[PDB]
């Protein structure tokens, strides 16, 4: 009487652990809901996958979570916290490796 | 050349002295014996 339930796994999770070198555009982690939040130089897709916006080293950190005020449910959740409480989340950052360019001598006019 | 001098020293080249260049003639594999027989690959 139990049908369905034959769906395969989504192969989600972290694709780049901490310290892994990541080029711009590489997907860092795919998640179904926000297990890891985007940090510095990390973007978010429609499906909440984290990709590197710059070329660098992936780092995972814990930071205080302050949601966008337009996120009404999160704002209410915060409104219900006690005074000392601060929410925390796991964030993924890309520490950019190369400089974004150098000045070169082109012509000795 | 020294090769022609070696020829001068060696026996006459005939149809009984001829050999293919090594590596040009792979051995033929046929399904007889333990290793190539039975189920014959």
């Amino acid at each position: 009487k139990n049908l369905g339930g034959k769906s395969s796994g989504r192969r989600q999770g972290i694709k780049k652990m901490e310290g892994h070198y990541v080029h711009a555009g590489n997907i860092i982690a795919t998640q179904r809901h926000f297990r890891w939040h985007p940090g510095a130089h990390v973007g978010v897709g429609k499906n909440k996958c984290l990709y590197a916006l710059e070329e660098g080293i992936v780092r995972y950190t814990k930071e205080v979570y302050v949601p966008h005020p337009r996120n009404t449910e999160a704002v209410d959740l915060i409104t219900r916290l006690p005074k000392g409480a601060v929410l925390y989340k796991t964030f993924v950052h890309v520490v950019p490796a190369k400089p974004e360019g150098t000045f070169k001598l082109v012509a000795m006019l | 050349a020294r090769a022609l001098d070696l020829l001068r020293g060696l026996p006459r080249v005939s149809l009984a002295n001829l050999k293919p260049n090594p590596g040009s003639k792979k051995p033929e594999r046929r399904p007889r014996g333990r290793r190539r027989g039975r189920k014959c690959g």
Partner: protein, 93 residues
């Protein structure tokens, strides 16, 4: 007096019993390994001291491996080997 099924696998197996000899053998092994624990409890260098102390040798060894791998190439061919085959018809005159 038979054990149902096949011995040593099923739910009902032949009762196996530990002999004094088996106990002594196991105890001997245990003593060896207790000594192993002791001798593994005193590292000579710390992890930070060992970091990089063999890097040069390891790099040279891998250079040797790479050289062997990249030096693979067909062997030389000599006129002498080809011409020596004429000797199959060497005779006495």
């Amino acid at each position: 007096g038979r054990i149902p099924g096949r011995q040593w696998i099923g739910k009902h197996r032949r009762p196996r019993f530990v002999s004094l000899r088996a106990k002594q053998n196991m105890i001997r092994r245990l003593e060896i390994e207790a000594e192993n624990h002791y001798w593994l409890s005193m590292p000579y260098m710390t992890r930070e001291q060992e970091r990089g102390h063999a890097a040069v040798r390891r790099r040279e060894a891998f250079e040797a491996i790479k050289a062997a791998a990249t030096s693979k190439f067909p062997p030389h061919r000599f006129i002498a080997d080809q011409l020596d085959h004429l000797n199959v018809t060497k005779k006495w005159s």
